Structure 1
Amino acid sequence: VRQVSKHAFSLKQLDNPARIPPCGWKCSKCDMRENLWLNLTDGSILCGRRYFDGSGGNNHAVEHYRETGYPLAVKLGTITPDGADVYSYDEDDMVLDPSLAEHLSHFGIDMLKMQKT
Structure 2
Amino acid sequence: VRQVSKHAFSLKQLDNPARIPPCGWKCSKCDMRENLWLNLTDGSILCGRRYFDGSGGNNHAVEHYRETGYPLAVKLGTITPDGADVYSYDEDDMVLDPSLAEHLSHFGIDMLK
Normalised by the length of structure 1, the TM-score is: 0.90
Query: 45-54 vs 102-111, which deviates more?
Result: 45-54
How much is the aligned-residue C-alpha RMSD, in angstroms? 1.2
Aligned positions, number: 112
Q: Would the aligned equivalents of 2:87 and 2:93 in 1 still touch at CA under 8 Å?
A: yes
Q: Would the aligned equivalents of 2:29 and 2:60 in 1 still touch at CA under 8 Å?
A: yes
**Shift of residue 74 of structure 1?**
0.3
For each residue in 1:17-53, what CA deviation from the matched residue of structure 2 results, as whole angstroms up to 9, or x when unmatched?
Answer: 3221101211011111121100000000000002335
Query: 23-32 vs 66-75, which deviates more?
Result: 23-32
SS in 1 for 2:63: helix
Structure 2 unaligned regions, length at least 5? none
**Shift of residue 55 of structure 1?**
4.2
Q: Would the aligned equivalents of 1:16 and 1:43 in 2 still touch at CA under 8 Å?
A: no
| Inter-partner Cα distance in structure 2 for 1:51 and 1:33 | 18
Q: After TM superposition, where is structure 1 displaced by more than 3 Å over at least 4 residues in a row? A: 51-55
Normalised by the length of structure 2, the TM-score is: 0.93
Between the aligned residues of both structures, percent identity stands at 100
Structure 1 unaligned regions, length at least 5? 113-117
**Shift of residue 54 of structure 1?**
4.1
